[PDB]
Amino acid sequence: SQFQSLEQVKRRPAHLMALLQHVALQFEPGPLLCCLHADMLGSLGPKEAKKAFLDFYHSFLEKTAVLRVPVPPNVAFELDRTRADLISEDVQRRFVQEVVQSQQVAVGRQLEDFRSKRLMGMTPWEQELAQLEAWVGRDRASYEARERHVAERLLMHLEEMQHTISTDEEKSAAVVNAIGLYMRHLGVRT
């Protein structure tokens, strides 16, 4: 049930990597990557979250952003009229939540597609995910360690096959960096 929702998969590194590889090769990766980085932003302090939000802006909200996601007109309007310093923590959370809300449909459809394809054996790394099923155990920390180990191998593999993400080197690089950033947040060594 790791794929029932983004909330459930965002915490499972190996399962998330499989989903990421699927999306990166079958859809526009922007929406899902945006949601993951937005969640990551929510676990940072006021100071760190401020710098992280600017990166989030440059990666997913700015006009020339390679991974630009469809931005709510209200947010885009306000961003173009708000100075970085003027950005309050409250206003920042609003922008993030509104942006994340507008990605739910696309990400929801992508999760749906992943679940259907998975039943047909049309999703990557199913063998690894299957093998993890036998090791949940009684110790959550030891299981979590196993998940991070598998995810690391999947991340290494995705980087090697970077060119298959897109013919645009700027795009594939942006995707790898984006996934790398979030995986590091889950304790997955790059």
Side-chain angles (χ1 to χ4, degrees):
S1 62
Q2 293 91 339
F3 302 110
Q4 292 299 295
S5 65
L6 198 170
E7 199 74 6
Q8 297 175 78
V9 75
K10 73 176 189 184
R11 311 175 184 166
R12 317 264 59 85
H15 300 252
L16 187 56
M17 278 306 307
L19 172 64
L20 256 356
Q21 178 171 143
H22 180 70
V23 173
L25 269 58
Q26 303 290 289
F27 306 94
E28 277 296 275
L32 178 57
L33 294 173
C34 175
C35 286
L36 300 179
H37 285 206
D39 189 88
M40 174 169 72
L41 258 52
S43 64
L44 298 176
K47 189 179 183 64
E48 299 178 292
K50 193 71 185 69
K51 294 178 180 177
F53 176 72
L54 303 179
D55 292 342
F56 175 92
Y57 169 81
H58 291 295
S59 291
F60 310 105
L61 315 175
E62 184 164 59
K63 182 195 302 179
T64 67
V66 204
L67 301 178
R68 191 173 203 252
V69 301
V71 189
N74 300 116
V75 169
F77 173 94
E78 294 180 85
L79 282 173
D80 296 346
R81 289 155 183 69
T82 307
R83 186 176 181 253
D85 271 43
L86 182 66
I87 294 286
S88 179
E89 289 112 44
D90 175 59
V91 184
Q92 183 180 295
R93 299 182 202 291
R94 296 187 189 206
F95 284 158
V96 173
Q97 302 297 28
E98 286 188 70
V99 165
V100 172
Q101 201 282 132
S102 58
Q103 311 301 309
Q104 292 303 124
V105 170
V107 173
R109 284 181 295 148
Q110 294 167 20
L111 277 171
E112 176 182 354
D113 185 72
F114 183 92
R115 294 194 300 267
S116 292
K117 298 287 183 59
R118 187 185 186 207
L119 296 174
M120 301 184 269
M122 293 169 84
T123 54
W125 305 115
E126 190 54 37
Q127 172 192 224
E128 283 61 28
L129 266 30
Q131 288 170 139
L132 278 167
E133 298 184 350
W135 295 95
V136 177
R138 297 177 186 248
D139 181 7
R140 197 62 183 171
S142 69
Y143 177 58
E144 289 176 343
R146 282 185 172 78
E147 294 187 286
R148 301 187 192 102
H149 185 257
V150 169
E152 288 170 6
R153 178 171 169 256
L154 309 201
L155 183 51
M156 178 179 275
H157 193 276
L158 182 48
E159 186 178 318
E160 293 182 333
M161 299 300 102
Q162 183 187 326
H163 54 284
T164 69
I165 298 175
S166 174
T167 173
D168 179 6
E169 294 167 18
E170 176 180 80
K171 180 170 174 294
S172 65
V175 169
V176 168
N177 290 343
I179 291 167
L181 188 63
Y182 188 79
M183 280 296 138
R184 197 168 304 132
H185 179 258
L186 299 180
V188 176
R189 305 178 190 98
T190 297

PDB file of all heavy atoms in Angstrom, residues 160-190:
ATOM      1  N   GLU A 160      22.947   6.562 -14.024  1.00  0.00           N
ATOM      2  CA  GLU A 160      23.664   5.935 -15.125  1.00  0.00           C
ATOM      3  C   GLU A 160      22.824   6.028 -16.394  1.00  0.00           C
ATOM      4  O   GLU A 160      23.351   6.325 -17.466  1.00  0.00           O
ATOM      5  CB  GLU A 160      23.985   4.473 -14.802  1.00  0.00           C
ATOM      6  CG  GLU A 160      24.981   4.316 -13.662  1.00  0.00           C
ATOM      7  CD  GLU A 160      25.345   2.871 -13.357  1.00  0.00           C
ATOM      8  OE1 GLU A 160      24.525   1.958 -13.615  1.00  0.00           O
ATOM      9  OE2 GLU A 160      26.462   2.655 -12.843  1.00  0.00           O
ATOM     10  N   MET A 161      21.519   5.802 -16.261  1.00  0.00           N
ATOM     11  CA  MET A 161      20.599   5.866 -17.397  1.00  0.00           C
ATOM     12  C   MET A 161      19.980   7.257 -17.549  1.00  0.00           C
ATOM     13  O   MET A 161      18.896   7.409 -18.124  1.00  0.00           O
ATOM     14  CB  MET A 161      19.487   4.827 -17.239  1.00  0.00           C
ATOM     15  CG  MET A 161      19.978   3.389 -17.174  1.00  0.00           C
ATOM     16  SD  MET A 161      20.894   2.887 -18.651  1.00  0.00           S
ATOM     17  CE  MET A 161      22.603   2.998 -18.066  1.00  0.00           C
ATOM     18  N   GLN A 162      20.682   8.266 -17.039  1.00  0.00           N
ATOM     19  CA  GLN A 162      20.217   9.653 -17.083  1.00  0.00           C
ATOM     20  C   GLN A 162      19.686  10.102 -18.443  1.00  0.00           C
ATOM     21  O   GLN A 162      18.651  10.760 -18.521  1.00  0.00           O
ATOM     22  CB  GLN A 162      21.339  10.596 -16.648  1.00  0.00           C
ATOM     23  CG  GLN A 162      20.930  12.053 -16.597  1.00  0.00           C
ATOM     24  CD  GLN A 162      22.087  12.986 -16.325  1.00  0.00           C
ATOM     25  OE1 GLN A 162      23.015  12.649 -15.590  1.00  0.00           O
ATOM     26  NE2 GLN A 162      22.035  14.174 -16.912  1.00  0.00           N
ATOM     27  N   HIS A 163      20.398   9.742 -19.508  1.00  0.00           N
ATOM     28  CA  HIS A 163      20.014  10.133 -20.865  1.00  0.00           C
ATOM     29  C   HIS A 163      18.632   9.663 -21.304  1.00  0.00           C
ATOM     30  O   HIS A 163      18.013  10.284 -22.169  1.00  0.00           O
ATOM     31  CB  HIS A 163      21.069   9.678 -21.882  1.00  0.00           C
ATOM     32  CG  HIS A 163      21.390   8.218 -21.812  1.00  0.00           C
ATOM     33  ND1 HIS A 163      22.178   7.678 -20.820  1.00  0.00           N
ATOM     34  CD2 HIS A 163      21.032   7.188 -22.613  1.00  0.00           C
ATOM     35  CE1 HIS A 163      22.291   6.376 -21.012  1.00  0.00           C
ATOM     36  NE2 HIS A 163      21.605   6.053 -22.093  1.00  0.00           N
ATOM     37  N   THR A 164      18.144   8.585 -20.697  1.00  0.00           N
ATOM     38  CA  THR A 164      16.834   8.044 -21.040  1.00  0.00           C
ATOM     39  C   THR A 164      15.695   8.865 -20.440  1.00  0.00           C
ATOM     40  O   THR A 164      14.537   8.708 -20.831  1.00  0.00           O
ATOM     41  CB  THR A 164      16.685   6.576 -20.581  1.00  0.00           C
ATOM     42  OG1 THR A 164      16.641   6.518 -19.148  1.00  0.00           O
ATOM     43  CG2 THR A 164      17.849   5.737 -21.095  1.00  0.00           C
ATOM     44  N   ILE A 165      16.022   9.727 -19.479  1.00  0.00           N
ATOM     45  CA  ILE A 165      15.020  10.573 -18.832  1.00  0.00           C
ATOM     46  C   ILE A 165      14.516  11.590 -19.845  1.00  0.00           C
ATOM     47  O   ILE A 165      13.318  11.867 -19.927  1.00  0.00           O
ATOM     48  CB  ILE A 165      15.614  11.331 -17.623  1.00  0.00           C
ATOM     49  CG1 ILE A 165      16.094  10.333 -16.565  1.00  0.00           C
ATOM     50  CG2 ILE A 165      14.580  12.304 -17.043  1.00  0.00           C
ATOM     51  CD1 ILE A 165      16.805  10.969 -15.373  1.00  0.00           C
ATOM     52  N   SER A 166      15.452  12.122 -20.625  1.00  0.00           N
ATOM     53  CA  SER A 166      15.168  13.113 -21.649  1.00  0.00           C
ATOM     54  C   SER A 166      16.398  13.325 -22.520  1.00  0.00           C
ATOM     55  O   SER A 166      17.533  13.110 -22.081  1.00  0.00           O
ATOM     56  CB  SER A 166      14.790  14.447 -21.000  1.00  0.00           C
ATOM     57  OG  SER A 166      14.637  15.458 -21.980  1.00  0.00           O
ATOM     58  N   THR A 167      16.167  13.758 -23.756  1.00  0.00           N
ATOM     59  CA  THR A 167      17.258  14.038 -24.681  1.00  0.00           C
ATOM     60  C   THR A 167      17.904  15.366 -24.282  1.00  0.00           C
ATOM     61  O   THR A 167      19.068  15.621 -24.593  1.00  0.00           O
ATOM     62  CB  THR A 167      16.762  14.117 -26.137  1.00  0.00           C
ATOM     63  OG1 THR A 167      17.835  14.546 -26.984  1.00  0.00           O
ATOM     64  CG2 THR A 167      15.587  15.083 -26.261  1.00  0.00           C
ATOM     65  N   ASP A 168      17.128  16.200 -23.591  1.00  0.00           N
ATOM     66  CA  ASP A 168      17.587  17.499 -23.107  1.00  0.00           C
ATOM     67  C   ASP A 168      18.466  17.252 -21.881  1.00  0.00           C
ATOM     68  O   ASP A 168      17.970  16.845 -20.832  1.00  0.00           O
ATOM     69  CB  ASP A 168      16.375  18.370 -22.730  1.00  0.00           C
ATOM     70  CG  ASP A 168      16.765  19.741 -22.177  1.00  0.00           C
ATOM     71  OD1 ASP A 168      17.963  20.098 -22.180  1.00  0.00           O
ATOM     72  OD2 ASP A 168      15.857  20.474 -21.742  1.00  0.00           O
ATOM     73  N   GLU A 169      19.766  17.499 -22.023  1.00  0.00           N
ATOM     74  CA  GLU A 169      20.719  17.297 -20.937  1.00  0.00           C
ATOM     75  C   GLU A 169      20.411  18.151 -19.713  1.00  0.00           C
ATOM     76  O   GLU A 169      20.646  17.730 -18.583  1.00  0.00           O
ATOM     77  CB  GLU A 169      22.140  17.561 -21.428  1.00  0.00           C
ATOM     78  CG  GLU A 169      22.616  16.551 -22.476  1.00  0.00           C
ATOM     79  CD  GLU A 169      23.886  16.979 -23.201  1.00  0.00           C
ATOM     80  OE1 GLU A 169      24.607  17.874 -22.701  1.00  0.00           O
ATOM     81  OE2 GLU A 169      24.159  16.417 -24.282  1.00  0.00           O
ATOM     82  N   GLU A 170      19.895  19.356 -19.947  1.00  0.00           N
ATOM     83  CA  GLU A 170      19.537  20.270 -18.870  1.00  0.00           C
ATOM     84  C   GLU A 170      18.369  19.682 -18.082  1.00  0.00           C
ATOM     85  O   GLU A 170      18.358  19.715 -16.856  1.00  0.00           O
ATOM     86  CB  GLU A 170      19.160  21.635 -19.457  1.00  0.00           C
ATOM     87  CG  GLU A 170      18.667  22.664 -18.455  1.00  0.00           C
ATOM     88  CD  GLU A 170      18.317  24.000 -19.102  1.00  0.00           C
ATOM     89  OE1 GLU A 170      17.210  24.124 -19.672  1.00  0.00           O
ATOM     90  OE2 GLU A 170      19.147  24.931 -19.034  1.00  0.00           O
ATOM     91  N   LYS A 171      17.413  19.098 -18.797  1.00  0.00           N
ATOM     92  CA  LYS A 171      16.248  18.496 -18.166  1.00  0.00           C
ATOM     93  C   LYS A 171      16.598  17.247 -17.355  1.00  0.00           C
ATOM     94  O   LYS A 171      16.225  17.133 -16.196  1.00  0.00           O
ATOM     95  CB  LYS A 171      15.188  18.166 -19.222  1.00  0.00           C
ATOM     96  CG  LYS A 171      13.917  17.533 -18.669  1.00  0.00           C
ATOM     97  CD  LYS A 171      12.838  17.462 -19.739  1.00  0.00           C
ATOM     98  CE  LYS A 171      11.602  16.711 -19.258  1.00  0.00           C
ATOM     99  NZ  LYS A 171      11.880  15.266 -19.012  1.00  0.00           N
ATOM    100  N   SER A 172      17.334  16.321 -17.955  1.00  0.00           N
ATOM    101  CA  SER A 172      17.693  15.099 -17.249  1.00  0.00           C
ATOM    102  C   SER A 172      18.574  15.403 -16.034  1.00  0.00           C
ATOM    103  O   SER A 172      18.436  14.766 -14.988  1.00  0.00           O
ATOM    104  CB  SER A 172      18.378  14.110 -18.194  1.00  0.00           C
ATOM    105  OG  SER A 172      19.611  14.613 -18.655  1.00  0.00           O
ATOM    106  N   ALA A 173      19.438  16.406 -16.158  1.00  0.00           N
ATOM    107  CA  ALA A 173      20.315  16.792 -15.052  1.00  0.00           C
ATOM    108  C   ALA A 173      19.488  17.377 -13.909  1.00  0.00           C
ATOM    109  O   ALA A 173      19.733  17.078 -12.739  1.00  0.00           O
ATOM    110  CB  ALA A 173      21.349  17.796 -15.521  1.00  0.00           C
ATOM    111  N   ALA A 174      18.483  18.178 -14.259  1.00  0.00           N
ATOM    112  CA  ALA A 174      17.599  18.797 -13.271  1.00  0.00           C
ATOM    113  C   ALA A 174      16.819  17.734 -12.499  1.00  0.00           C
ATOM    114  O   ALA A 174      16.611  17.856 -11.293  1.00  0.00           O
ATOM    115  CB  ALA A 174      16.636  19.760 -13.957  1.00  0.00           C
ATOM    116  N   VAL A 175      16.397  16.691 -13.205  1.00  0.00           N
ATOM    117  CA  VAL A 175      15.651  15.590 -12.594  1.00  0.00           C
ATOM    118  C   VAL A 175      16.547  14.803 -11.640  1.00  0.00           C
ATOM    119  O   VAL A 175      16.159  14.515 -10.514  1.00  0.00           O
ATOM    120  CB  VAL A 175      15.075  14.645 -13.671  1.00  0.00           C
ATOM    121  CG1 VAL A 175      14.530  13.370 -13.045  1.00  0.00           C
ATOM    122  CG2 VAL A 175      13.977  15.358 -14.443  1.00  0.00           C
ATOM    123  N   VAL A 176      17.751  14.464 -12.090  1.00  0.00           N
ATOM    124  CA  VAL A 176      18.679  13.723 -11.241  1.00  0.00           C
ATOM    125  C   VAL A 176      19.027  14.521  -9.978  1.00  0.00           C
ATOM    126  O   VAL A 176      19.005  13.976  -8.871  1.00  0.00           O
ATOM    127  CB  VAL A 176      19.950  13.319 -12.018  1.00  0.00           C
ATOM    128  CG1 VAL A 176      21.027  12.809 -11.061  1.00  0.00           C
ATOM    129  CG2 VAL A 176      19.601  12.237 -13.023  1.00  0.00           C
ATOM    130  N   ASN A 177      19.304  15.814 -10.142  1.00  0.00           N
ATOM    131  CA  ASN A 177      19.623  16.685  -9.007  1.00  0.00           C
ATOM    132  C   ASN A 177      18.449  16.734  -8.037  1.00  0.00           C
ATOM    133  O   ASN A 177      18.615  16.619  -6.820  1.00  0.00           O
ATOM    134  CB  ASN A 177      19.919  18.112  -9.487  1.00  0.00           C
ATOM    135  CG  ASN A 177      21.221  18.214 -10.248  1.00  0.00           C
ATOM    136  OD1 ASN A 177      22.060  17.324 -10.175  1.00  0.00           O
ATOM    137  ND2 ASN A 177      21.398  19.308 -10.981  1.00  0.00           N
ATOM    138  N   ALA A 178      17.255  16.915  -8.589  1.00  0.00           N
ATOM    139  CA  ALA A 178      16.040  16.997  -7.791  1.00  0.00           C
ATOM    140  C   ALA A 178      15.800  15.728  -6.984  1.00  0.00           C
ATOM    141  O   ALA A 178      15.477  15.793  -5.793  1.00  0.00           O
ATOM    142  CB  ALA A 178      14.841  17.290  -8.689  1.00  0.00           C
ATOM    143  N   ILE A 179      15.944  14.573  -7.631  1.00  0.00           N
ATOM    144  CA  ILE A 179      15.749  13.303  -6.932  1.00  0.00           C
ATOM    145  C   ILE A 179      16.861  13.144  -5.895  1.00  0.00           C
ATOM    146  O   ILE A 179      16.601  12.779  -4.751  1.00  0.00           O
ATOM    147  CB  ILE A 179      15.739  12.107  -7.922  1.00  0.00           C
ATOM    148  CG1 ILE A 179      14.477  12.175  -8.790  1.00  0.00           C
ATOM    149  CG2 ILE A 179      15.770  10.786  -7.169  1.00  0.00           C
ATOM    150  CD1 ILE A 179      14.494  11.257  -9.998  1.00  0.00           C
ATOM    151  N   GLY A 180      18.083  13.498  -6.282  1.00  0.00           N
ATOM    152  CA  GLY A 180      19.208  13.397  -5.369  1.00  0.00           C
ATOM    153  C   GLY A 180      18.985  14.194  -4.098  1.00  0.00           C
ATOM    154  O   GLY A 180      19.212  13.699  -2.990  1.00  0.00           O
ATOM    155  N   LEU A 181      18.478  15.414  -4.258  1.00  0.00           N
ATOM    156  CA  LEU A 181      18.220  16.295  -3.129  1.00  0.00           C
ATOM    157  C   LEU A 181      17.237  15.690  -2.136  1.00  0.00           C
ATOM    158  O   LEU A 181      17.494  15.663  -0.931  1.00  0.00           O
ATOM    159  CB  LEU A 181      17.705  17.655  -3.620  1.00  0.00           C
ATOM    160  CG  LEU A 181      17.552  18.763  -2.572  1.00  0.00           C
ATOM    161  CD1 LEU A 181      18.917  19.107  -1.991  1.00  0.00           C
ATOM    162  CD2 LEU A 181      16.929  19.991  -3.213  1.00  0.00           C
ATOM    163  N   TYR A 182      16.128  15.166  -2.643  1.00  0.00           N
ATOM    164  CA  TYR A 182      15.117  14.582  -1.778  1.00  0.00           C
ATOM    165  C   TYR A 182      15.557  13.261  -1.142  1.00  0.00           C
ATOM    166  O   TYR A 182      15.220  12.982   0.010  1.00  0.00           O
ATOM    167  CB  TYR A 182      13.795  14.396  -2.531  1.00  0.00           C
ATOM    168  CG  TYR A 182      12.669  13.979  -1.616  1.00  0.00           C
ATOM    169  CD1 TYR A 182      12.017  14.916  -0.814  1.00  0.00           C
ATOM    170  CD2 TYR A 182      12.289  12.647  -1.509  1.00  0.00           C
ATOM    171  CE1 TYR A 182      11.018  14.532   0.080  1.00  0.00           C
ATOM    172  CE2 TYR A 182      11.289  12.253  -0.619  1.00  0.00           C
ATOM    173  CZ  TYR A 182      10.661  13.201   0.168  1.00  0.00           C
ATOM    174  OH  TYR A 182       9.672  12.818   1.039  1.00  0.00           O
ATOM    175  N   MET A 183      16.278  12.438  -1.898  1.00  0.00           N
ATOM    176  CA  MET A 183      16.751  11.155  -1.375  1.00  0.00           C
ATOM    177  C   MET A 183      17.707  11.382  -0.203  1.00  0.00           C
ATOM    178  O   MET A 183      17.679  10.655   0.784  1.00  0.00           O
ATOM    179  CB  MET A 183      17.435  10.339  -2.479  1.00  0.00           C
ATOM    180  CG  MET A 183      16.464   9.617  -3.416  1.00  0.00           C
ATOM    181  SD  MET A 183      15.472   8.347  -2.531  1.00  0.00           S
ATOM    182  CE  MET A 183      13.834   8.628  -3.265  1.00  0.00           C
ATOM    183  N   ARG A 184      18.530  12.417  -0.314  1.00  0.00           N
ATOM    184  CA  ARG A 184      19.485  12.775   0.733  1.00  0.00           C
ATOM    185  C   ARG A 184      18.701  13.121   2.004  1.00  0.00           C
ATOM    186  O   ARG A 184      19.135  12.826   3.116  1.00  0.00           O
ATOM    187  CB  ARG A 184      20.298  13.974   0.261  1.00  0.00           C
ATOM    188  CG  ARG A 184      21.582  14.237   1.008  1.00  0.00           C
ATOM    189  CD  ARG A 184      22.398  15.259   0.233  1.00  0.00           C
ATOM    190  NE  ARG A 184      22.635  14.806  -1.138  1.00  0.00           N
ATOM    191  CZ  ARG A 184      22.452  15.546  -2.229  1.00  0.00           C
ATOM    192  NH1 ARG A 184      22.026  16.800  -2.132  1.00  0.00           N
ATOM    193  NH2 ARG A 184      22.683  15.021  -3.424  1.00  0.00           N
ATOM    194  N   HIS A 185      17.512  13.693   1.812  1.00  0.00           N
ATOM    195  CA  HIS A 185      16.621  14.068   2.907  1.00  0.00           C
ATOM    196  C   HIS A 185      16.084  12.817   3.613  1.00  0.00           C
ATOM    197  O   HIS A 185      15.743  12.856   4.794  1.00  0.00           O
ATOM    198  CB  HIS A 185      15.461  14.905   2.358  1.00  0.00           C
ATOM    199  CG  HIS A 185      14.466  15.324   3.393  1.00  0.00           C
ATOM    200  ND1 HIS A 185      13.245  14.705   3.544  1.00  0.00           N
ATOM    201  CD2 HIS A 185      14.506  16.310   4.320  1.00  0.00           C
ATOM    202  CE1 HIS A 185      12.574  15.291   4.518  1.00  0.00           C
ATOM    203  NE2 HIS A 185      13.317  16.268   5.005  1.00  0.00           N
ATOM    204  N   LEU A 186      16.001  11.710   2.880  1.00  0.00           N
ATOM    205  CA  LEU A 186      15.522  10.454   3.447  1.00  0.00           C
ATOM    206  C   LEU A 186      16.678   9.615   3.992  1.00  0.00           C
ATOM    207  O   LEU A 186      16.479   8.476   4.406  1.00  0.00           O
ATOM    208  CB  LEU A 186      14.748   9.646   2.400  1.00  0.00           C
ATOM    209  CG  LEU A 186      13.495  10.285   1.797  1.00  0.00           C
ATOM    210  CD1 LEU A 186      12.880   9.330   0.778  1.00  0.00           C
ATOM    211  CD2 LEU A 186      12.490  10.625   2.899  1.00  0.00           C
ATOM    212  N   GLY A 187      17.883  10.180   3.984  1.00  0.00           N
ATOM    213  CA  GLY A 187      19.047   9.465   4.485  1.00  0.00           C
ATOM    214  C   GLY A 187      19.710   8.583   3.442  1.00  0.00           C
ATOM    215  O   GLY A 187      20.627   7.818   3.755  1.00  0.00           O
ATOM    216  N   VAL A 188      19.251   8.691   2.197  1.00  0.00           N
ATOM    217  CA  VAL A 188      19.797   7.896   1.107  1.00  0.00           C
ATOM    218  C   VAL A 188      21.045   8.572   0.555  1.00  0.00           C
ATOM    219  O   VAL A 188      20.980   9.666  -0.011  1.00  0.00           O
ATOM    220  CB  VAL A 188      18.748   7.687  -0.012  1.00  0.00           C
ATOM    221  CG1 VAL A 188      19.352   6.941  -1.201  1.00  0.00           C
ATOM    222  CG2 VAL A 188      17.558   6.916   0.538  1.00  0.00           C
ATOM    223  N   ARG A 189      22.181   7.910   0.741  1.00  0.00           N
ATOM    224  CA  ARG A 189      23.466   8.424   0.285  1.00  0.00           C
ATOM    225  C   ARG A 189      23.577   8.446  -1.232  1.00  0.00           C
ATOM    226  O   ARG A 189      23.229   7.480  -1.910  1.00  0.00           O
ATOM    227  CB  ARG A 189      24.606   7.600   0.886  1.00  0.00           C
ATOM    228  CG  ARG A 189      24.563   7.529   2.401  1.00  0.00           C
ATOM    229  CD  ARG A 189      25.680   6.668   2.958  1.00  0.00           C
ATOM    230  NE  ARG A 189      25.489   6.408   4.383  1.00  0.00           N
ATOM    231  CZ  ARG A 189      24.948   5.297   4.877  1.00  0.00           C
ATOM    232  NH1 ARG A 189      24.540   4.331   4.065  1.00  0.00           N
ATOM    233  NH2 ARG A 189      24.808   5.154   6.189  1.00  0.00           N
ATOM    234  N   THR A 190      24.049   9.572  -1.752  1.00  0.00           N
ATOM    235  CA  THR A 190      24.222   9.759  -3.188  1.00  0.00           C
ATOM    236  C   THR A 190      25.645   9.390  -3.617  1.00  0.00           C
ATOM    237  O   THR A 190      26.605   9.957  -3.047  1.00  0.00           O
ATOM    238  CB  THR A 190      23.910  11.220  -3.590  1.00  0.00           C
ATOM    239  OG1 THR A 190      22.534  11.504  -3.299  1.00  0.00           O
ATOM    240  CG2 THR A 190      24.177  11.453  -5.076  1.00  0.00           C
TER     241      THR A 190
END
